[PDB]
């Protein structure tokens, strides 16, 4: 018996990944973040960001949360907002698919569509949303905050306090390694802090897609974001406030074809149909397991479902145009 949908955020189960485990002689588990009520890992940061604003008195009932995002952050924030009596203003590039717009509007988000732009442009959806929140707070009696998912460290805090502790509990103290990809960095940096507090010998790995800068930076100090990836939710080009102080023990750069080969096999063989970041993550877990050797327990994150990537990630025409693997059953 819970008082609202918010009580169902978190305490997600660990699912044994049987190929990956068999291939490595390790017990490799994926944390089922798709079983959050917002259907992604972002429910955790969304909950903490909004509760933090509440605790600091920056939101009263009817107040508004602003964020620049065409991803799960918008979905998670809007679900939490509606459950707590707030509104969301989601800044989104006008070039974003009708699907992504519809998924947000479905839940009640107010969309603010802007022409698309690089992060160096101050009208880029992410940076613009900060200035929008400042203006709105002048004409919104009940407040207006910028979620600021990249640099708001209560994001990382969510994972210190919930994700990490759940993992420790559910592995009965036995976890040896943790691996995740980075968008805001909250998941990897926060879970790393929580886990290492419990056992300093736990190894932490970054799993990084092409087009991201983090692998190059942590491994060689180079500033460089070569290539590109069709994965969404991940791929970071700066050291966000959530990443401050973070250094991984291992770092792996995962090409799209490796992630998708794993992702598609997972559907066929294990009944899990997940987003692209999950293929990146599992690839990373396999590599971490191989570095440590057999007889270890490795945990990674199954961040969301594949359903909402079906127009690209699970679309044969799109994949062939990108010179990427196609799901055999869709031929």
């Amino acid at each position: 018996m819970f008082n609202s949908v918010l009580d169902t955020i978190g305490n997600t189960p660990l699912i044994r990944l049987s190929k990956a485990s068999e291939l490595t002689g390790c017990d490799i588990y994926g944390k089922a973040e798709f079983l959050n009520p917002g259907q992604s890992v972002k429910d955790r940061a969304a909950l903490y960001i909004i509760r933090d604003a509440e605790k600091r008195g920056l939101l009263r009932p009817g107040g508004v949360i602003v964020e620049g995002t065409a991803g799960n952050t918008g979905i998670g924030l809007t679900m939490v907002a509606k459950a707590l009596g707030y509104r969301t203003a989601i800044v989104i590039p006008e070039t974003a698919s009708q699907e992504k717009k519809d998924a947000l509007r479905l839940l009640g988000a107010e969309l603010i569509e802007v022409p698309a732009a690089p992060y160096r442009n101050p009208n880029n959806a992410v940076r613009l949303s900060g200035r929008l929140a400042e203006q709105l707070a002048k004409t919104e009696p009940n407040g207006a905050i910028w979620a600021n998912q990249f640099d708001n460290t209560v994001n990382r805090q969510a994972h210190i306090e919930t994700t990490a502790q759940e993992i420790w509990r559910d592995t009965s103290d036995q976890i040896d390694g943790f691996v995740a990809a980075v968008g805001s960095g909250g998941t990897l940096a926060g879970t790393a802090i929580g886990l290492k507090e419990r056992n300093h010998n736990i190894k932490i790995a970054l799993a990084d897609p092409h087009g991201a800068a983090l692998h190059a930076f942590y491994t060689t100090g180079e500033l460089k974001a070569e290539g590109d990836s069709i994965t969404e939710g991940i791929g970071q080009g700066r050291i966000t406030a959530n990443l401050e102080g973070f250094t991984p023990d291992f770092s792996y750069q995962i090409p799209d074809a490796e992630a998708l080969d794993i992702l598609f096999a997972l559907v066929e063989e294990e009944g899990l149909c997940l987003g692209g970041s999950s293929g990146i993550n599992i690839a990373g877990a396999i590599r971490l397991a191989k570095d440590l050797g057999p007889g270890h327990t490795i945990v990674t994150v199954l961040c969301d479902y594949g359903n909402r990537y079906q127009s690209k990630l699970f679309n044969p025409a799109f994949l062939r145009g990108k010179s990427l693997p196609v799901p055999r059953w869709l031929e």
Copy 2:
């Protein structure tokens, strides 16, 4: 630490419905079946149907499960099949939710679309699928079984053994009333059996959409259907094997507009975006709570997500054409 995605089926949480509860002076909970890994209540029957066939030696790896379904049963069956090494052949009406069709193809079901037809017609997807199973059994050395959700009573058994016991346990013996709508009848009939074994004066209600025949049967003795409903997964015209021996203590006929009004308010006010049957169910829960009186604990089922229906149920053009309410925030 779970063995496969199948371990995450069931043990779904009860979520308090605040407006419904406040309205009735009762504690009204919705059981969150959308938090199953297949994203609907059908995961339970799907699991039990396939395990049953396994136990009887009718399926072995590479075998095929055949089903006629509106969608969710196909999705649940295909997820379980892939986790266990089977294929599915899914017979679905052309008229089914596009989102359910997309989910089926993504999961790797072999999808066979057929014209919509009444049950009296032998080319109705359900009756057709039975004959396909018979045909396929001739040439599938690893077995071909008919899931037969409507008349396969391990469907009902699933809810006797899991759903009901979970509700009894999680309400700490305090549940006074249970309500749900009927497709196969597995959920309502099975949960009623399990609950009434634990406490025989728990009261049970049917919530029936227009176009279904059951309300008329239970209140008058005649199976009579009138009107129509845009809700999916529910609306039954005969006493299925899963309904044998079932008698509700109360029966309510719920118009679409009543269900939608509740559903749309739920998104805005409580952060829950659910499928059509959930609106029917919650409308029934309100009426049951009013019949029992204040101070009671009522449980119903939140069967799946609204995003599974976005093109109709949450589509203003469609809803206006059907002369139904439109979500306010869709402008």
